[PDB]
């Protein structure tokens, strides 16, 4: 997270750290949508050029964390992965279209002050909130610059589609949205490498719940003028998310 600030404790209780077993390495961010299911970006799990093609027993999730490096005794919860789910039409070779992956946990987590799930948006909420000029929130332990000790937080306005499309040469899809300040708006901030899988959340003024509208997917550099971070459109792909989660008995 570039040009942001430290998270408050319990500010992002749905924040999940995707962690490699061997060697011990922070891999990606992620979101907690139930005691059992974790949402992330697909290129965290499957991006073959970077030797990323992980199976279930390669990875673990760390839930409820604030510190990047420090283990937190009675705060964080570590769970193994039962099954990895990647969108059927995920496109890693071109533009990271449908950059979305679900993870089933072997060990379900108990909710606390530091652990709590984020809502997935229904159609009306997504239509009412996912609009240009409206600000969302991005969290992560990713890079502070292009080149943190604790979780980082930045609020970014959703950018209209023509501006997202013109800012880049990479092909834009309706399964994406971009966010960030325009150069003539003065303010700044962006996601960066390491932030992927991290939630792009918005607070509803109607029921004052937090909804995850996006997943940190891709971008060109970090916090560059005239450039915008691109996010997986969660609701556009909510039809796949529904099929995966509603499959099994409780």
């Amino acid at each position: 997270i570039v040009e942001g600030s430290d998270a408050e404790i319990g500010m992002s209780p749905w924040q999940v750290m995707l962690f490699r077993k061997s060697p011990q390495e922070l891999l990606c961010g992620a979101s907690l949508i139930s005691d059992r299911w974790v949402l992330t970006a697909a290129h965290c799990l499957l991006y073959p050029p970077w030797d990323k093609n992980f199976t279930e027993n390669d990875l673990l999730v760390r839930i409820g964390k604030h510190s990047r490096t420090r283990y937190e005794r009675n705060i964080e919860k570590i769970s193994m992965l039962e099954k990895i789910y990647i969108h059927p039409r995920y496109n890693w070779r071109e533009n990271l279209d449908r950059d979305i992956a679900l993870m089933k946990l072997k060990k379900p987590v108990a909710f606390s002050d530091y652990i709590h799930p984020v809502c997935l948006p229904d159609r009306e909420t997504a239509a009412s909130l996912l609009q240009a000029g409206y600000k969302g929130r991005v969290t992560g332990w990713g890079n502070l610059k292009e080149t943190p000790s604790v979780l980082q937080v930045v609020n970014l306005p959703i950018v209209e589609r023509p501006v997202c499309k013109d800012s880049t040469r990479i092909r834009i899809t309706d399964n994406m949205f971009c966010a960030g300040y325009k150069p003539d708006e003065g303010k700044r901030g962006d996601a960066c490498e390491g932030d992927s899988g991290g939630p792009f959340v918005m607070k509803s003024p109607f029921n004052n719940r937090w909804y995850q509208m996006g997943i940190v997917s891709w971008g060109e550099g970090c916090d560059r003028d005239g450039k915008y971070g691109f996010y997986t459109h969660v609701f556009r792909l909510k039809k796949w998310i529904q099929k995966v989660i509603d499959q099994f008995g409780e």
């Binding site: 408050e8 209780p13 984020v118 600000k135 509803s204 719940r209 937090w210």
Partner: peptide, 28 residues
């Protein structure tokens, strides 16, 4: 899942976070 999006240390405590208002004010 039924209690999603309500933070124990914020919404459930009736406490506003550091930059929460930046989101609410952008809906104009």
């Amino acid at each position: 899942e039924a209690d999603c999006g309500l933070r124990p240390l914020f919404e459930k405590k009736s406490l506003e976070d550091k930059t929460e208002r930046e989101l609410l004010e952008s809906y104009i």
